[PDB]
Each structure stands twice: as C-alpha cells, then as structure tokens.
Amino acid sequence: FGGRGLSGTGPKAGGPLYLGRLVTTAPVPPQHSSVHTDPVLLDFAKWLDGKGARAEAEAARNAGSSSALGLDLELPGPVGERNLYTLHARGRILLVPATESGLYHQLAAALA
Amino acid sequence: REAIDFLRYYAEQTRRTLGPGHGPLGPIVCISPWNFPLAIFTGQIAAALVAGNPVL
Amino acid sequence: APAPFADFAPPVRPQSTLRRAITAAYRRPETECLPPLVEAATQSKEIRDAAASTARKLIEALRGKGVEGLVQEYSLSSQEGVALMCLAEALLRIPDTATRDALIRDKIADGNWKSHLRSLFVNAATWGLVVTGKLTSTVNDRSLAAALTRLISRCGEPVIRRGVDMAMRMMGEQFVTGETIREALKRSKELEEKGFSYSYDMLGEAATTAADAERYYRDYESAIHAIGKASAGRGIYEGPGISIKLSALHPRYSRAQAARVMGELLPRVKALALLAKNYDIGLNIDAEEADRLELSLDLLEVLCLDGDLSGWNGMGFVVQAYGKRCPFVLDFIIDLARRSGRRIMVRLVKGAYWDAEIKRAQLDGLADFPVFTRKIHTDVSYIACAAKLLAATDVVFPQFATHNAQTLAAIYHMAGKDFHVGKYEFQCLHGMGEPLYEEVVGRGKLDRPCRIYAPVGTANSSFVHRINDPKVSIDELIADPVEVVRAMPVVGAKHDRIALPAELFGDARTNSAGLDLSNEETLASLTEALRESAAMKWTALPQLATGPAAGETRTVLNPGDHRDVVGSVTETSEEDARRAVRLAADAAPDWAAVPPSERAACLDRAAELMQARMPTLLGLIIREAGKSALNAIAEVREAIDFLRYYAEQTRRTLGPGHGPLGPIVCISPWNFPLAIFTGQIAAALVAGNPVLAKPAEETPLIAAEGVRILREAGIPASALQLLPGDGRVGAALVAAAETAGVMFTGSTEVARLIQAQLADRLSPAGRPIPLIAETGGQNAMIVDSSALAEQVVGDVITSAFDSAGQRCSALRVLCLQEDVADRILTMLKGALHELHIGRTDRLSVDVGPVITSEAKDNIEKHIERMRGLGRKVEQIGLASETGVGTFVPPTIIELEKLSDLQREVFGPVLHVIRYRRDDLDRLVDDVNATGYGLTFGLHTRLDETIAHVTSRIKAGNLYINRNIIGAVVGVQPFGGRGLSGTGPKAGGPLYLGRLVTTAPVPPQHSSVHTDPVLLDFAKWLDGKGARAEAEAARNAGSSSALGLDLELPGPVGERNLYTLHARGRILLVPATESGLYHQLAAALATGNSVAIDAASGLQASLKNLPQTVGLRVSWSKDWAADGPFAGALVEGDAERIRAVNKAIAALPGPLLLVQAASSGEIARNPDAYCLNWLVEEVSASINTAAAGGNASL
C-alpha cells in the first residue's frame, strides 16, 4: 500500500522495499529483479564507451542489470482475485551532480 | 488483523533479507494517525524495530 | 553418367524376415502394439500377489531410509539454492583448495563474487532440477544474481562453504562414480564386496567432429584397459564392464551415412570389443535415438558374426521397452545369439529419449511415434519383453535395468526360484538405484545381483519422483500396469494430451505428412518411385487459358550433373505473356464468382494430390533444383501446408465484400521451386484472383507439375496460367496494364525493378498496385558463452549449408562471444569436413550443387576476394565427380568486422565474427545496420540476454536455441522487414488480406492495447477543435492490433510466438490538414513515428503538439535523407498519388508498403488507410527442449 505524487514518498507499506529504507545499505528484496534492460540506458552506455569513459560505461551496464524496472509479479492471495505487483519508472529524476563522472553515474542510475 | 499481518510480514521480510552489512539508521521517530491507530502505528514501528532501529 | 537414384539408399544388407518384422513395427499404432504385450506380460494371480507383496516390502524399505537440508538450514529460497549451487560449481573450477578458500573468505563472502568468477549461472537449469525438481530451458540470471547477492549478504561465508562442500560431493561422488576411471574403480570396491557389479560409462556421446570421435575412442580404449586390469579375470558377469555410445565414435552416425558407419565406425567398435575380449569384460552398446536402432543392429550383427571376436560373451546391447519395435528387436537379437553362438548381454531399459522422440516425430510429420505415449504402456512393454528374455536365458544374458520396485518385483517373481550368477541380473544407475538394490543384492535380501551403471568424467510420472512424493501411496506404486492396461476402455489408446503429427493443428487443418528416411521399407519404396520419376518426360509449357502455346524449347539440366537431362521447357513469348494477362482479366469475374469455400476446396484437393504424389515430386525437385531428399520432403510438405493453410484462412475470413484485386502476377524463385511457387499462387487464387504464374527460369518443370496439380484439383485454366521463361517474361507480366497485383520472391534488386515499374500505374480504383516482395537477408546468429557448443555447431552447419546455403533464411554471419569463439570455430571447422557434397540422388549427400554456373561464379568470386584480403577461409575439398555439375564447397570465412560483408552471398558461405561480451548491444546495432531483417538466431541460456537481444534486433523471424531455417507455415509465419521484404508474412494471417481490395479481419487479429501517443494525439485534436479527427484517432487506436501477442500451435518442445509491433517511421505525404490528422492517427495508433512531407505546407496544422507526440513527428523536405522508412501514407488525387508513388519508389533502401487515398476517401471510408499494413509481424520460435528435456512433457 502506498502511492506517488502528493500521496507519499514510498516505499509501499506491507511491501518488499519497505525495510530497505530503514537501513543504511538496502538489501535485495525477495523476488526483486528484472530481465528487462532499459534501452536508453543501453544507448547511454554505448555513448560512454565511444567516449572512452570505460568505468562509467561499466557502471551504466551494471545499473541496467541490477535495476528491477519491469518486475511483474503475482502475489499470493485469496482465490477469485489476482494481485499484481509491478515496478515502473518513477518519472523525471532531479539530478544535482557536482562532477562529470558523478553526472554519468546519476544518469546511468536514473536511465536504468 | 492488519497489525498482525504487518508484524509477521516484516518479520518474514527480515528473515529473507537482513544481514550484518545492512546497518540500522538509529533512532526512528514513528508518527502515526488516528484513523488506523493500531495497524499503521504497529506497521511503522515494527518495520523500524526489525530493521534494527530503536523507535520513538 | 550414373543412372539417377540407382544408388539412392541401398541397405547395409538384405532385410531378413526378422529384420522386416522390426521395421514393420516402427510406428505401429499404439492400440495394436499393446494387446500382445498385455498377453505376454500376464502372470498368474499367485505371482501377481507375490510380486505386489515384494514390491510393497521394497518400497517400505525405501521410504524408511542433502541439498534440502542445506536449503532448510539457511532458509534458502529455491532461487537462492540454485544460485548457491552455481556459485559452488564456479568455485570448484578453482583447482587449489587454499586458493579457493582464500577467495571465499576474502572476496566471495564479502559480496564481491562477480568480479572473481561466462555467467555464473550457465548450468542453473541443471541445478534448478536438482533443487526444485523442475526443468526450465533457460535461466533467469537476474533473479539468480539477486538471490546470490541476497543469500551471501544474509548468511556470509558459512553458507558458501556448505554449498561448496555439497556441490563437491554431488558432482564428484553422486552424479559420477569418479572423475576418472581410476577413481571410479577405486570407489567401486565397496559395493563390489557387497555383491554389486559395475558398468562404466565414460561420459561421451554425439561426436561433432572427427577429433571428438577420436577423443571418445581413446577414452573408451584407456578405460577398457583400466577396467580389464581391475577386473583381474573375474569375467563378464562377476567383473566390471564398459558401456559405449555409438554416436560418440563417429560424427556422422546415421542411416543416411550408413556406408561411412559400416566402413569407419564398425572397425572402431570392433577394436574396442577386441580389447574387451582380451580382458574378458563386458562391452555394452547403449541405445540412443529411435532412428539409430536398426542401424545399430547392423553393427551388432557384423560384430557377433566376426570370428576375431569369438570365444567372448561380453558383447552387450540395450533395447528400449518404450519403443514399439522392442519385442521384435529382441526376437532378432535372440536369433542372432543362436546363429553366432554368442550369449549376447541384453540390457532391457525403458528409454531415455522420450521427450525428444515425441518432438521429432511431430516435426517430421510422421505417421505415429516410435515410442509409446503413455508411461504405463512402457511398463507393460518392459514386463512383456522381460518374459521373452527370461525364456531365452540359455542363449542371452538378460540385464533388467530399472529403478521401479514394481517392475523389479514383477520380474523377480517371473524369473522363479532357479537362479545362478550368470542367468540374468538387474541393473541400476550409480547414486540413484543403490537404496533400492541394497534391498535386492545379497543372500539376506532377494539374492539377485545388480550391475551399477557408473558415469565417469568431469518427471512426475517417474518412480524416483513418486517414491519421494508423500501423496503417492504404496498401493499406487505397486499397482500392476498389466492389469491396469487390460481394464482400460481402449487398450493401448494414445495419450490424450499428445497430438499425432497429423493432428498438430487440430481442427484448423491437417498437417502435411513426411517420410521416414530411416525406415527401410520407405527407403526401398522411395528408391523405386524416385527412379521412376527420373524416367518421366517432364515438360513445362506456356499454359494459357486458351491452351498450350508454342515457343522456344530448351532442355532443363540437373545442376548436380549437367549430363542428366531432367526435362524440356518451352518458354513464353513476350506477346503470349501479355495475352495471358488479358485472358486472366477476361476470366477474373468468373473466378471471383466461385464462392470462397469452393476456391478453398480446390486448394485442399491440390494438397491431397501433392501429398499422394510426394515421392514423384521429390524426385523432380531433387534432380531439377539440386535439393537433397530431406529438403525435397520439406518443400513438398511446405507446399501442402500453404495450400491447406490459405484454404483454412479463406474459410475463416473471406466474404463477398472482400473483392479480388484482379489478375495477379506470381514470380517465384528457383530455391523453393514448388513451395514458394505454390504458396504465392494458392493465396492469390483463393483470394479470388486469376494468376499468371512465372516460375524461375531454372526450375520450370516442378512449376508445371504444380500447375497441373492445381488444375486437376479444379482451378480453371483461365484462373491459373503458367508462363515459363526468363526475366523478360516476368517484366512483360508486371508491365501489363491489367496486372492488378504482383507477388515476388527473389532478389532485392529485381524487386526494386518491379516496384519501379508498378509505380507508374494505378488500380482501377486509383490505388497503388499491391506488391508483396520477399527478398534477401543477411541473417545473423549470436552465440554467447552460455550456449552449448555442440548444439550451436549443429544448428550453424544446418543453417548455413543446408540446401547449399540457397535459403533466404540461411545463416550468413555467425557472431561468437570471444571467450568461446576458438572452441566453437574449431568444432565448426571439424563438422564442416564431415559433410558429403555431391549429386543429390543419394541419401548420403548432405549438400548439393548451387543452381547454376553463374551462381557458382558469383559465390566463388566472393570467396576469392575474402581470401585475397587475408581472411581465413576454410573449405571442404570436393570430389572429382562434382565437376559435371555446379558445386561450391561449404566455406567458412572469418571476418574482422560485420562491415567486411557488403552484399548477400547466396551460397554455402558462413562468415564468422567475434565480439566482446560488453559489445553485445553494439553488435545488435551492427546487425540491424545492414538494413536487412529476415531471420535471426540467438543461442544463449540466459533470460537477460534473450530479453535484451530480442528486444533490440529488428528481424521478422527470430529463433532461440535452434537453427534459423525451415520456417513452418502457420507456426513461424515467414517474412522480414527492411531490405528483406514488404510483408505481409507468407504462411501468416495477414497474407490473404493483401490480395483483396477490402481486407478482412484475420482470425485472432485484435489487441486490447492502445498506443499512448495515439491517445495523446486524439486529446490534442479535441483541444484544437478537430472533433471528427479526434474520434477517428480514437477509433484507429481501438482498431489497431498493435500489441497482439499469440502463441501458435506447433510441436512439443518449442514455443512459437507471433506478435504485432510498430513498423518504424512512416512517411506521411498528406494533401489536406484533415488528411494529415487521419494519416497521423493511423500511424500513431500502430506505434509508429512519422516523417511528414514538408512540401505539404501543413506545418501550421501541428502547432503545440504534446511532447509525447512531438517526439514521434519529424518533418522531411529530403525524403531520401530522412529514411529509411517502414511504410508510407499518401493523400491526393490519382495524378498526385502516381507522382508520390514514383518518388517513394526512388527512395534508397527498403521497398515501402505505400497506401493511398483521396481526400474524399479519407472523409468517407474509416478504413481508407488499412492498419494491417502499418504494423510489423514478428515470429519467434524458442526451442524449449534446449536444456536437454521438455518441462511440460
């Protein structure tokens, strides 16, 4: 339970991301993964590689893999009901970088 | 029931995930509403506690 | 000049009565196999009670006595358990224990596991089976990576150490008896002292190359010495033996290669048997696929009659009770034992290849399966065959391999009280059967010996699963399959949920039937039919509506041997071609008036005729087109499938409002001279159009026979005219004023010439003349380090060199991940040199000629250019006999970059490039950058790579973990994008709608998804006051089938998906603002972006677009600079449409599917622009047996 916009910050109560917010290093929640890779992230990583920013291109690819964007799960519940849980893009992320590499890392995270 | 489910859910989620590298924040202030005065009260507190934080 | 087909497939020896009885049973209906097995397996009430009691006692012992404890101790999820075992396997690839323990403590236990160790999860499908009992073909590596991170961060080093110790015990001691034969022998002493014996299996099968066969040979030879040394004179019953697989000892172990098998494989088996003889140990020949059974009998017969092997009774042979031939095979073996005086060791098994046999028989369209389809039938078969064996213990040594306590008990009591070591034995698998047979071996138990099948190296129906299932009672486990089967309503009924090959498509249509080229009766019958076909005076004539026409006559030659004259073609004059079109125009109303179901009945009758005539048609295709027998079967099957598929699609769709175009020119290629020929013509005909059939100049005879068959089936002469000849005939047909549509399959360059000719003309209704053009592909396959090299090599060899690479789908560029490139390349070159190239009237020929000398010269010029550039070129050496025809040796060329390849080379030429893992996405970019988009293959076990690659590749036909050729009608609807074609896909549901002036709604053609940019545009339209256009936009959003996602019925072990995607960027050439809005709505509703003609002057009509729509809109002054486009929408009067259609035809790159409407038509007709032609069909075929088995089966 929990919404977006004026309805709150997330993560959802009674959901698998909740405890991760209450620790300084978040764990990987159960079933939290996705085989989808954001295609713009991929385009960004190739651009970084063509630019010689090999550390950032590597970081971008790793972000694309570890992102759980596109997760699409059915949760156990009662008969006669289908309860679905999905991870989507949040929207537009404000990036406040200080350095070029910081910007590449933030952009990779947001694009992924 | 919702309070009970929060307790057991966050307990199981902890058993599935939390290890020594997932350090706590420290004291967490949990401010709850009057419309779910047990369930949301318990859910926030249980989550903060089981993640290793003392709760106000 | 050798007489055609005189040496097609002579058997290894004349088939004895006993051998013919085996062959007769090959695919015998299950209801006919089972009654005699029931009768043979019947035992007395007293014995049945005694057996049920013994089986109960065994099962009670079993249930009253690893990975699951680990999962419990650390609270692991299933994915965590699998991921842990994959980690442990990887850590065990580190040889030095202290080095591994340091890595765990210092790097792995701290979360850094990816940097220190190819995906960790390449074998996760195996570990998944271990952990969960469930099999997947591919691996969710992102889930496993998350799970591994989670479990390490939660549990740390202790869980890793426990996982490592568990995997080491399982892989070193439970999956195998030992990593080496010396180790396996050391570990066998314990159970040999308790009364077991051993048969060692040096893990080895399916040799791909001569070098691999030689490696397996020396593994067997070295093992025989080690086992014989250890046996130390214990003899064949008390002492250990060896088991071999014939497929390990020769890379071409098949009936088609029987001469090489007898000449090259047999001496190797003899040499190993001679060594086993000198040590007096057992040497057992394992049983493999059903199409190798009878071939293996020829080896068994020679060996048992070879006097050099006399005095030794250690030769053994497996027979599989799940096979319908098993009792007849046993009759043959028992007789062979009597004749030879050798006491043949006969291992009775149920069988290990069940899933693969079901899939293979379905793929091959054969009459029935060579195995039973109900497990209980295999159990009855087993017991029946045990009865036969137990009656012959004086001449054979039965070896009852089973883990099923009920099966065991039935046979134990069937055998009765008299026993001595050497009379018979049981057998079981190492690390699986010992708990059961610990209750059997030894004077304190049942006092019967058991031989353990011992591997050596580095299913809810199963007894082993059911024994561990608490919901399965002992009563269920000791149920007598013989009496259960006897009591069924139909004894031997096929399994309800498995389709016979003929019924693969259920009520939709009848699957075409193939021929079993491993069946000696079929081969003998086919030899005669093929020879007879070569004595026929095949002709092709201009067959006009008014009768055959006179013309210039030339001979048609076998491309594999120009001395072999196949027939005569009389070619069509340009004047008669033009007359044919006028005759078709005159006859068009009469054919259009034949009701669609009757037109479809013509197609169905032609399919029956082609099916009946298949053997004769095969012989013609083999000799006229240079095809192998197998490829000719596939081609006739495809023609049958087209006929039946388009007939069914007609019955599903066509009514009187779907008016025909008029005369359709069908230009077909030489590489599928019957199937593509038939498919184009059948579709046009059944859509109500009269057809001018222009076959390739190289292959007119089979075309004439196809027309003869269609006319015999009821197509009137005026509706189907045959116009043999060269491109002048094709050009005359295309240019004829009354030509209303063209279906072309051939080169992109000729398609472009046709498009330019058609651009000058409009239909009677003022629309562009439809062109369906299927053209080339520069087809790639990407292979990552998770793929199985042997599967890859087989699929590459087939995809690249089948039909001499003269498939439009043929594999042109193989992309190998760098880490595995050298190993796969070495195996590929080795497999290349096992191919037999020659005239195709021999079953042993793998690759035939290319079609003409000009084709040969063009291909060879490419190869020499690459060789001149310093590229490594691998070529098979050709025999001198190829000189009389036009052959190109199968060739492998290693390229530096995909850009080194600049043109489609239509021959048996595989290009290989290597890529770094991190460059996969750029590689997909480079593949797409050719502009082609026909077939594409991906070999990987990793879901993340599948999702990534298949979401980025732009190709019409995708293939996962299989070859990329032989697309099946209605299963992999065939056709690509870009330079590869206009679409719609042949053998797909959009095809017929292109051949009528008003397209029907295809079966299953809808989508509940609405393009969101369409929706934003419709809101913008309403904001601007364009209320009618907004409504039309919303209607287009609903009518669009973008997002359609279907699974098509096909064989087990494969998932065949059909999806509708956006085409790409549509060129919009509007005339009015309202026209622009309607065009934009049509394009957006189908997921496309647009480039709008800037010369329209309508820029002010798109002020203030939402950003979402703006992102999809470009304005184009220079259309050729802003492409490639994927289609075009045009508005204007007839002169404007003609001028735009001519300008679009001049655009470089792909042939654009153009739709045109007048402004008034846009206002009047909601379907002025048809959305069928604004989406792109994609077919994806996933081999789900690829991990070794079939989960759902």
Ligand SMILES: Cc1cc2nc3c(=O)[nH]c(=O)nc-3n(C[C@H](O)[C@H](O)[C@H](O)COP(=O)(O)OP(=O)(O)OC[C@H]3O[C@@H](n4cnc5c(N)ncnc54)[C@H](O)[C@@H]3O)c2cc1C
């Ligand atoms: C020592 C040993 C050596 C062997 N050597 C070979 C060999 O050389 N070649 C070979 O092919 N097999 C061989 N096998 C057999 C194969 O590997 C399986 O172990 C065997 O089929 C399992 O049968 P079962 O009596 O143990 O168990 P069960 O659970 O009784 O029988 C399972 C078997 O039933 C059959 N089956 C399952 N479902 C169906 C169905 N729907 N319709 C029809 N049949 C079905 C399959 O054959 C399956 O393996 C060998 C087995 C042993 C123990």
Ligand SMILES: O=C1CCc2cc(Cl)ccc21
């Ligand atoms: O069949 C051929 C080869 C050349 C060609 C050109 C056109 Cl316009 C039509 C057909 C054909």
